[PDB]
Enzyme design. Structure first.
Site, short mmCIF file in Angstrom:
data_model
loop_
_atom_site.label_atom_id
_atom_site.label_comp_id
_atom_site.label_asym_id
_atom_site.label_seq_id
_atom_site.Cartn_x
_atom_site.Cartn_y
_atom_site.Cartn_z
N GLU A 35 0.82 -1.20 0.00
CA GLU A 35 0.00 0.00 0.00
C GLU A 35 0.86 1.26 0.00
OE1 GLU A 35 -2.97 0.33 -0.75
OE2 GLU A 35 -4.10 -1.45 -0.15
N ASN A 46 -7.76 9.04 -5.58
CA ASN A 46 -8.60 8.08 -6.30
C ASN A 46 -9.40 8.78 -7.40
OD1 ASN A 46 -7.89 5.95 -4.46
ND2 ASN A 46 -9.34 6.85 -3.00
N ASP A 48 -12.50 8.96 -7.99
CA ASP A 48 -13.74 9.60 -7.56
C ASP A 48 -13.50 10.88 -6.75
OD1 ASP A 48 -13.03 7.11 -5.83
OD2 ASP A 48 -14.04 8.47 -4.43
N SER A 50 -11.79 11.03 -3.80
CA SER A 50 -11.31 10.65 -2.48
C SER A 50 -9.79 10.47 -2.52
CB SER A 50 -11.99 9.36 -2.02
OG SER A 50 -11.72 8.32 -2.92
N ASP A 52 -6.40 8.29 -0.45
CA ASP A 52 -5.95 7.25 0.49
C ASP A 52 -4.74 7.76 1.26
OD1 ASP A 52 -7.76 5.40 -1.04
OD2 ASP A 52 -6.17 5.74 -2.54
N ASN A 59 -8.91 5.13 2.97
CA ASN A 59 -9.65 5.96 2.01
C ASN A 59 -10.63 6.94 2.67
OD1 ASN A 59 -11.10 6.83 -0.26
ND2 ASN A 59 -11.12 4.79 -1.19
C1 LIG Z 1 -9.30 0.11 3.33
C2 LIG Z 1 -8.98 1.16 2.28
O1 LIG Z 1 -9.23 2.35 2.49
N1 LIG Z 1 -8.45 0.69 1.15
C3 LIG Z 1 -8.04 1.54 0.02
C4 LIG Z 1 -9.01 1.36 -1.15
O2 LIG Z 1 -10.29 1.91 -0.80
C5 LIG Z 1 -8.49 2.06 -2.40
O3 LIG Z 1 -9.30 1.66 -3.53
C6 LIG Z 1 -10.01 2.69 -4.21
O4 LIG Z 1 -11.31 2.76 -3.59
C7 LIG Z 1 -12.28 2.99 -4.64
C8 LIG Z 1 -13.05 4.30 -4.36
O5 LIG Z 1 -12.13 5.37 -4.18
C9 LIG Z 1 -13.87 4.16 -3.08
O6 LIG Z 1 -15.03 3.37 -3.34
C10 LIG Z 1 -11.46 3.13 -5.91
O7 LIG Z 1 -12.23 2.68 -7.05
C11 LIG Z 1 -10.34 2.19 -5.59
O8 LIG Z 1 -9.22 2.41 -6.49
C12 LIG Z 1 -7.05 1.65 -2.68
C13 LIG Z 1 -6.48 2.48 -3.84
O9 LIG Z 1 -5.15 2.05 -4.13
O10 LIG Z 1 -6.21 1.89 -1.53
C14 LIG Z 1 -6.62 1.12 -0.37
O11 LIG Z 1 -6.56 -0.28 -0.67
#
Ligand SMILES: CC(=O)N[C@@H]1[C@@H](O)[C@H](O[C@@H]2O[C@@H]([C@H](O)CO)[C@H](O)[C@H]2O)[C@@H](CO)O[C@@H]1O
Ligand SMILES: [Cl-]
Ligand SMILES: [Cl-]
Ligand SMILES: [Cl-]
Ligand SMILES: [Cl-]
Ligand SMILES: [Cl-]
Ligand SMILES: [Cl-]
Length: 129
Positions: A35, A46, A48, A50, A52, A59
């Site tokens: 990660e 991300n 959308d 958001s 991380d 996230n």
């Molecule tokens: C537990 C956690 O927060 N894991 C994050 C993932 O959420 C993240 O994946 C992204 O989440 C989706 C949307 O942003 C939210 O529904 C995206 O489609 C997806 O790429 C990931 C990104 O590398 O990082 C952690 O695993």
């Protein structure tokens, strides 16, 4: 802060992440490796809108507040910046909530794609635990 492998394993263990929800310490270390490459300051945007945050790339869509993810939740009740601290307490406490949400560690994309099913014990090999 960029943790060493065994250094992070020890910190995660002290904070009770080892075998938490049935996930051995190697799973958690592997997840952090892929990660964030063990970097507490890691951030990634991300599609959308958001972001991380931190060593476990938690996230803002669900878990923390950054004030720039409209419609999102803050289920860990923390500012996302708290997940970037050199002290991993906030990230661990939030990870505990996430892994309890129903889908276990599958919430971590990098864990599912790069750790799940592999020899995760390798990640704590030689560590003084
Ligand atoms: C537990 C956690 O927060 N894991 C994050 C993932 O959420 C993240 O994946 C992204 O989440 C989706 C949307 O942003 C939210 O529904 C995206 O489609 C997806 O790429 C990931 C990104 O590398 O990082 C952690 O695993
Ligand atoms: Cl490593
Ligand atoms: Cl393990
Ligand atoms: Cl927001
Ligand atoms: Cl906040
Ligand atoms: Cl720590
Ligand atoms: Cl991945």
């Amino acid at each position: 802060k960029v943790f060493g492998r065994c250094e992070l394993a020890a910190a995660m263990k002290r904070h009770g992440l080892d075998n938490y929800r049935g996930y051995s310490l190697g799973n958690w270390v592997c997840a952090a490796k892929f990660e964030s490459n063990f970097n507490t300051q890691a951030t990634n945007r991300n599609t959308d809108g958001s972001t991380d945050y931190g060593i476990l790339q938690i996230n803002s869509r669900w878990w923390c507040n950054d004030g720039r993810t409209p419609g999102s939740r803050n289920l860990c009740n923390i500012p996302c910046s708290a997940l970037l601290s050199s002290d991993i307490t906030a990230s661990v406490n939030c990870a505990k909530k996430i892994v309890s949400d129903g889908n276990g560690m599958n919430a971590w994309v990098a864990w599912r794609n790069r750790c799940k099913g592999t020899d995760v014990q390798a990640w704590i090999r030689g560590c003084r635990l």
